[PDB]
Write a protein that binds this ligand. Sequence first.
Ligand SMILES: [Mg+2]
Ligand SMILES: [Mg+2]
Ligand SMILES: [Mg+2]
Ligand SMILES: [Mg+2]
Ligand SMILES: [Mg+2]
Ligand SMILES: [Mg+2]
Ligand SMILES: [Mg+2]
Ligand SMILES: [Mg+2]
Ligand SMILES: [Mg+2]
Ligand SMILES: [Mg+2]
Ligand SMILES: [Mg+2]
Ligand SMILES: [Mg+2]
Ligand SMILES: [Mg+2]
Ligand SMILES: [Mg+2]
Ligand SMILES: [Mg+2]
Ligand SMILES: [Mg+2]
Ligand SMILES: [Mg+2]
Ligand SMILES: [Mg+2]
Ligand SMILES: [Mg+2]
Ligand SMILES: [Mg+2]
Ligand SMILES: [Mg+2]
Ligand SMILES: [Mg+2]
Ligand SMILES: [Mg+2]
Ligand SMILES: [Mg+2]
Ligand SMILES: [Mg+2]
Ligand SMILES: [Mg+2]
Ligand SMILES: [Mg+2]
Ligand SMILES: [Mg+2]
Ligand SMILES: [Mg+2]
Ligand SMILES: [Mg+2]
Ligand SMILES: [Mg+2]
Ligand SMILES: [Mg+2]
Ligand SMILES: [Mg+2]
Ligand SMILES: [Mg+2]
Ligand SMILES: [Mg+2]
Ligand SMILES: [Mg+2]
Ligand SMILES: [Mg+2]
Ligand SMILES: [Mg+2]
Ligand SMILES: [Mg+2]
Ligand SMILES: [Mg+2]
Ligand SMILES: [Mg+2]
Ligand SMILES: [Mg+2]
Ligand SMILES: [Mg+2]
Ligand SMILES: [Mg+2]
Ligand SMILES: [Mg+2]
Ligand SMILES: [Mg+2]
Ligand SMILES: [Mg+2]
Ligand SMILES: [Mg+2]
Ligand SMILES: [Mg+2]
Ligand SMILES: [Mg+2]
Ligand SMILES: [Mg+2]
Lengths: 150, 128, 138
Amino acid sequence: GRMHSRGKGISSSALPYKRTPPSWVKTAVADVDELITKAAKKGQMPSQIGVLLRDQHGIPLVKSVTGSKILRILKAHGLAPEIPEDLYFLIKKAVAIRKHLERNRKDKDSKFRLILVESRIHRLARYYKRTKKLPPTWKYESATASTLVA
Amino acid sequence: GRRILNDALRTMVNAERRGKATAQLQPISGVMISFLNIMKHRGYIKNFEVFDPHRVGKITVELQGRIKDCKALTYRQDLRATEIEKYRTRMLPTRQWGYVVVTTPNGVLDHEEAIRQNVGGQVLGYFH
Amino acid sequence: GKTRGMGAGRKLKTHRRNQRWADKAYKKSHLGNEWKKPFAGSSHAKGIVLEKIGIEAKQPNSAIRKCARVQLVKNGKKIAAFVPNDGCLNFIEENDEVLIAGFGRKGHAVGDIPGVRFKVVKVSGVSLLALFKEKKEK
RNA sequence: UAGGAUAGGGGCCUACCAUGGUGGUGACGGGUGACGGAGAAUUAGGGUUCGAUUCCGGAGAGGGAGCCUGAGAAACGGCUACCACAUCCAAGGAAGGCAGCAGGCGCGCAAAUUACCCAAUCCUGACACGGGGAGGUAGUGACAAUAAAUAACAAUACCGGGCGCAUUAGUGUCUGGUAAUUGGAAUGAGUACAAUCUAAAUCCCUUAACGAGGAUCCAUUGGAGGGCAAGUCUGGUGCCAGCAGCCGCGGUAAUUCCAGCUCCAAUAGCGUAUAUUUAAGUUGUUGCAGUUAAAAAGCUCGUAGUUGGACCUUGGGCCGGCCGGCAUCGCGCUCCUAGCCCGGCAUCGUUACUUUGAAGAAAUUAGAGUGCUCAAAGCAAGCCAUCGCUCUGGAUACAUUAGCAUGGGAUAACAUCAUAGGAUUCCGGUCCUAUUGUGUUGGCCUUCGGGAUCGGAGUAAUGAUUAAUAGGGACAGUCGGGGGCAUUCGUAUUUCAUAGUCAGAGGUGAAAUUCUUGGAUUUAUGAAAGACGAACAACUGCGAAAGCAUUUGCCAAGGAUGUUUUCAUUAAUCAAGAACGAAAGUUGGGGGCUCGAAGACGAUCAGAUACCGUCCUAGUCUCAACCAUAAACGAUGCCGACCAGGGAUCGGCGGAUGUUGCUUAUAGGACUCCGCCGGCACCUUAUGAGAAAUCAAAGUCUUUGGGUUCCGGGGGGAGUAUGGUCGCAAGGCUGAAACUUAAAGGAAUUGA
RNA sequence: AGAAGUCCAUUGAACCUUAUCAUUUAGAGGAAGCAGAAGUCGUAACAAGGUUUCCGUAGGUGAACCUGCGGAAGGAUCAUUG
RNA sequence: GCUCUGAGGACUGACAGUCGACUCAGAACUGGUACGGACAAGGGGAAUCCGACUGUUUAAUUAAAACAAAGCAUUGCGAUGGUCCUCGCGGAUGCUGACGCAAU
RNA sequence: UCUUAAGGUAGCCAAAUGCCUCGUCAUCUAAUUAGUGACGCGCAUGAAUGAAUUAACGAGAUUCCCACUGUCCCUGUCUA
Ligand SMILES: [Mg+2]
Ligand SMILES: [Mg+2]
Ligand SMILES: [Mg+2]
Ligand SMILES: [Mg+2]
Ligand SMILES: [Mg+2]
Ligand SMILES: [Mg+2]
Ligand SMILES: [Mg+2]
Ligand SMILES: [Mg+2]
Ligand SMILES: [Mg+2]
Ligand SMILES: [Mg+2]
Ligand SMILES: [Mg+2]
Ligand SMILES: [Mg+2]
Ligand SMILES: [Mg+2]
Ligand SMILES: [Mg+2]
Ligand SMILES: [Mg+2]
Ligand SMILES: [Mg+2]
Ligand SMILES: [Mg+2]
Ligand SMILES: [Mg+2]
Ligand SMILES: [Mg+2]
Ligand SMILES: [Mg+2]
Ligand SMILES: [Mg+2]
Ligand SMILES: [Mg+2]
Ligand SMILES: [Mg+2]
Ligand SMILES: [Mg+2]
Ligand SMILES: [Mg+2]
Ligand SMILES: [Mg+2]
Ligand SMILES: [Mg+2]
Ligand SMILES: [Mg+2]
Ligand SMILES: [Mg+2]
Ligand SMILES: [Mg+2]
Ligand SMILES: [Mg+2]
Ligand SMILES: [Mg+2]
Ligand SMILES: [Mg+2]
Ligand SMILES: [Mg+2]
Ligand SMILES: [Mg+2]
Ligand SMILES: [Mg+2]
Ligand SMILES: [Mg+2]
Ligand SMILES: [Mg+2]
Ligand SMILES: [Mg+2]
Ligand SMILES: [Mg+2]
Ligand SMILES: [Mg+2]
Ligand SMILES: [Mg+2]
Ligand SMILES: [Mg+2]
Ligand SMILES: [Mg+2]
Ligand SMILES: [Mg+2]
Ligand SMILES: [Mg+2]
Ligand SMILES: [Mg+2]
Ligand SMILES: [Mg+2]
Ligand SMILES: [Mg+2]
Ligand SMILES: [Mg+2]
Ligand SMILES: [Mg+2]
């Protein structure tokens, strides 16, 4: 279950069977490459990109329309995340926690939470460094962490 | 975590010891299908339908209630074709029936087939 | 429960090695103290009698079990040693050479005798059974 | 690196340079009553213990060190020196080394001959020829192992059961026993002419005359309450002596002691003692246990360790009686093996697994053959017309691992194609070697062969498995007494002040200490201080556990749910390491309401250091810093799967009409019905489990294996001594042994 | 060629001072545990054991023990819709 | 002591030219085993008692265990006040104010 | 049981505090009124008159040991 708390929930997305896009999705894959690149150049990460297509422009799945995932479109056009998405978000979270905690020295439960967040950053960074998506000596320096995000 | 071929074998044991007619197995495998084939071929379960929609997969087996037990010896040992014979006594109810299913380089297959083809392997499980 | 991993042979051998020590018999044999015991890893042990003493018997019984304090000539220890049979104690005498055997129960005191682990089977090199059964007198 | 030295590599040594090597996969050190191995015991399988020893390898000659002779020695049945020990001495000096055979001292529980011989096996010499305490033989030998005597057969007899009838007899058949009963048979233990054996004697195997009357040619060792097979026999003893491995016997009717008769067990053996194997599934890999019996770390994070989801053609087959060989939609072959244009050919990922093979020292282990008489053995031996030699054997098996090799390629690791620096028949350019056209050696060079580089055209289906009822992350509305900082609020208590009023009040079962006409208690009003957050408050929520209840705000975080978002194995549990950790406690500021260890009093009591009451210190509260334990409890580690039923309830979500003291009308919110998740639980039931109480998870276990961590091995001693280490201190973490003991303990049943 | 002697080297016993490690053994006194025997004093615990039991911590007491603060039930309550 | 070896730099145009006062390693040879050769220059250890330490003290017999000390504690005082001086008027602490003054 | 306002608690000791006294036991010694470690009916120890310890320090008081020396045995001699 949930790694850093004993919750055991199973809520998630369940993708429809038909890999082929539904009829009313007549979207032109060149035009959705334009849409992705416009949304990414707008500063935005793949999660929000996928949300905007799902909700605004009615694109069920980028891979059902195009056959190419959001990240691999962005990599092909050179707009990828320089820090991979979820590691980015974990670093942003830990910077926020630590900025609060330097003002509240007696908030021990957030000392625990920050230890958990940095544990999680380090596990995910170990993975990315074995998969060659980060430089092999990229190290999460808590001091020089606030620049790299937000 | 999972070590399926257990999620499945203990599911069929539970279902059959209770007396259910059809059991469904949430993960599948080449090992699962090749294992159930050994059971069916030796005549212990009837047919089974493999729901492969698009995911890990799913199986539903239709039991005859004629199987009595099946187990996975996770901790898959190694097994030469001479100590086939001191497992067949070690795990099985007798020297007559019951089969030990050993993965061998000629696919997943039971121990008498293994002796006839003169190969060893690694024990996956057994049933009787 | 158990570690049944295939690559955990080291873990299980080390576990059995560390836990074989909480067994009393193994710890007793492989800790070495049999070699600080009075026989120091001996079957019997010859010695000299210092005095025939006589020691009471534990509570359910009531007696004067006739023991002899002997000294071991191999290592200088002094111990007590029962003289088993009816009247047979008299054949023992102070500064007679006696072989101290085990009294039974493998190094632990036996019967109603408090704190005695040793029996006398020979005195002056003559069988103590032989003097009891008047076969061969010293 | 350079060199020296050695037979030779080498830090084996030197000079110079570099600072490396090893280590939680246990280095280094410490113990070993440790030479290593082949192997020995026990063994259902797995294992446990042992291995001085005759075969192999090493080491050593009292302890070390150094050497000559020699092919070979750092040799000791050779020397040189020192240390220990000791011998002869004519007093100057000299000679030493039994862990060789034999023997003696000593040590010890514990170990034979100061014998004979080179005849066998082999070695050695100048050598058929000498020598061999190697070796063999004789002597002591209950180390262990083998075969195996101590009587057999008869009729008489008091008898004793069928069977001749069974009746009603009587005797009668296998001979069952007490028969020193009666009797003729047989024999070797022993003795002994010999012969044979032997290198010579001897043991044996053969055998002349001896050699048996059941007292003798004599069988014992341990028992007779249970475990454990066999005395409710008879005398003695009187909780004495004594037995008894454990339970127990013995205090005057002792089956247990001590004895006689009887019986039992094994029987040329049997007990005792210690070590050790089995028993022991009480060391549990196969194969234990952790709710309550011994035992889940307080809780979480966590590195190494261990473990890891699914997916990728051998998918249909001809073929001849398990496979050879074969097609489809088999990237190439020039080289060996290479067909009557042809199977089946090399180099351009690693292993683990398994198969077959090689090679594996003998003795041992199993196992074949063989009549040493059998046997344990041994490696012999068998028929000829047992007449001038035939037939011969002296097999095979195993050998765990590591290493070498062939084929298999399921299972699992390690490794890795999205920047295309990818693959691809071709084309020439950068440049080089050279062969038959250099009959001699050859040597730069023209189309040519090969590196290597190298640009462009070519073709290919041109190159990334899904998105786990795994995980992270994202977004949405929520939810919570989860956290921090600030903050409003509440009565009450205490003290005070103001006012009234007069004999009590407080306390208990009862009293007093106490307060009280200096007005106590009681009444009201106001103030101040500091703690606590009633009732709502639950088989309810939040939290990793500890824990968390007045209000509002800010701060950051979090589970669940919802999702046609994203990434794609990123995960589980975790020695080292790290965070939080109630109360008490310790240091120092702030506060000092109530309560209150200590302390003092008042009662009680035999006493009362206590229960009861009065006063009260530290403390109780906040802050800064420590501590690191609780019955830190669900006495139940964490992750995962399946299995039974139901209604409640908390959170979210989805679906339904039917009314609101709401709502510009619907929606929403409150309530009702249904259903999904996810919580804490709860109730009935075994078809389950278990020692049971009990448990729907403590279930899916002798039909035993999903992963992972920690931990227990009778009760004490003892969480003690010591050593270490953290702490200011109390303490915490780690943590024995001696010796003691036969029960301690769990669950339930009857009673009292 | 060659002896005695001698030189500079290398191996180096062996003796000696010190340090240090390990294995035994003495010690006035101090203080543990165990066991015995027919002892002294109490009543702590097992029933509501007459103050419910016990667990962490602090202090005190002849001894058992008491008391404070916090916890638990292994409690003498599975219960207030009465 | 003597003779050497090596290392450690500057300036000018990874090399060349010139310069460089000093320090540090190592070896040979040598002497009546003498070498910090004069000078200068700690004896060491095992324990007790006292005072924590540094400091000060009876000038001319006592240098100390005595005094001071940091640390701890106590007391008074909120200005019309506390401790103190003056014969008086007045003053010291006070150019001060409780984290202060004062007395032990 | 008398008695007090309270009966010297934690500690400590023949201590610079102990008359008895050269206390008793151990060690140091050939021999120790000394020293140290203990024992405590403490003439007359004892808690900020501060109790018990205590690393470093000390021209402080004591005791033993190693090296050292004319301090001594036991005196001699040289120089200003
Ligand atoms: Mg985890
Ligand atoms: Mg799940
Ligand atoms: Mg008993
Ligand atoms: Mg070299
Ligand atoms: Mg040895
Ligand atoms: Mg040998
Ligand atoms: Mg010797
Ligand atoms: Mg030698
Ligand atoms: Mg030698
Ligand atoms: Mg010799
Ligand atoms: Mg000998
Ligand atoms: Mg008897
Ligand atoms: Mg008898
Ligand atoms: Mg018996
Ligand atoms: Mg019997
Ligand atoms: Mg016996
Ligand atoms: Mg008996
Ligand atoms: Mg045991
Ligand atoms: Mg045992
Ligand atoms: Mg057990
Ligand atoms: Mg327990
Ligand atoms: Mg890890
Ligand atoms: Mg009034
Ligand atoms: Mg609530
Ligand atoms: Mg409230
Ligand atoms: Mg604990
Ligand atoms: Mg616990
Ligand atoms: Mg727990
Ligand atoms: Mg609900
Ligand atoms: Mg629900
Ligand atoms: Mg135990
Ligand atoms: Mg218990
Ligand atoms: Mg009970
Ligand atoms: Mg009581
Ligand atoms: Mg009580
Ligand atoms: Mg109770
Ligand atoms: Mg008290
Ligand atoms: Mg009190
Ligand atoms: Mg001073
Ligand atoms: Mg100074
Ligand atoms: Mg003076
Ligand atoms: Mg002076
Ligand atoms: Mg003034
Ligand atoms: Mg006293
Ligand atoms: Mg006084
Ligand atoms: Mg005194
Ligand atoms: Mg003296
Ligand atoms: Mg003294
Ligand atoms: Mg006094
Ligand atoms: Mg005084
Ligand atoms: Mg001084």
